[PDB]
């Protein structure tokens, strides 16, 4: 009938928007989809996002295909940061080692894209490096003993200063 992509949580598969109405319009029940998703991903840590593909057939039958989580989430978890940087390149949010990049590439090689495209891990590592560049995360060759925490402290103070500046700008705009 069509192709449906959805970013769904591991266990927080609610029958509400913005996913319930689409499947209801398609015709399949949403309770069955939520139950199937929960039983299939009951062994996955609840809270993480993951892309999935839903196939709807005439007579209102559905099937679920689930891929690996987003590289954004992978790299943010590796760097220990909650949110990415605003000004990419000019500011840096965290540091991810080439070793972490290789681990992420190995764990994500078993996805639909890189499975159908049988390519060496070098291509996946380069893709992860580009994703980190977009994320604003620098990729140092081999440097993590305590400078990671040293950079974490200054990143925290910079984030606090940025929050204060944003609050001041919002207050000035409101008073203007």
């Amino acid at each position: 009938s069509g192709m449906i992509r959805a970013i769904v949580r591991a266990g927080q598969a609610r029958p509400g928007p913005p996913l319930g109405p689409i499947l209801g319009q398609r015709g399949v029940s949403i309770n069955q989809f939520c139950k199937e998703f929960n039983e299939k991903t009951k062994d996955i840590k609840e809270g993480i996002p993951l892309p999935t593909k839903i196939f709807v057939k005439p007579d209102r039958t559905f099937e679920i295909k689930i891929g690996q989580p987003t590289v954004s989430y992978f790299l943010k978890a590796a760097a220990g940061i909650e949110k990415g940087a605003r000004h990419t390149g000019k500011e840096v949010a965290g540091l991810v080692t080439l070793k972490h990049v290789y681990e992420i590439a190995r764990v994500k090689a078993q996805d639909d894209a890189f499975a159908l495209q049988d390519v060496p891990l070098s291509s996946v590592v380069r893709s992860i490096i580009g994703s980190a560049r977009s994320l604003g995360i620098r990729v140092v060759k081999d440097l993590s003993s305590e400078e990671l925490a040293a950079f974490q402290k200054e990143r925290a103070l910079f984030l606090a200063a940025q929050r204060e500046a944003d609050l001041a700008a919002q207050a000035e705009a409101a008073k203007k």
Partner: protein, 80 residues
């Protein structure tokens, strides 16, 4: 809705590879278990046109990208 870690646990292992409920995080295997060519990739600025030699596919891929960029810039003004 997961959680990250502040201490040296980041420097001792990664927090993204572990997806299943069990905390079977992978250890940091040394160079004796990791490929040597992994640590020999350009992680800084991307390779430039004057840096790439004209006898590789990378040079022509970059040239094609630059040509597409030039066409987009010159066709920014869409008369029709």
């Amino acid at each position: 809705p997961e959680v990250c870690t502040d201490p040296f646990r980041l420097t001792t292992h990664a927090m993204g590879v572990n997806i299943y409920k069990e905390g079977q995080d992978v250890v940091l295997k040394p160079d004796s278990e990791y490929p040597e060519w992994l640590f020999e990739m350009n992680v800084g600025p991307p390779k430039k046109l004057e840096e790439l030699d004209p006898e590789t596919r990378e040079y022509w891929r970059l040239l094609r990208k630059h040509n597409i960029w030039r066409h987009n810039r010159l066709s920014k003004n869409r008369k029709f």
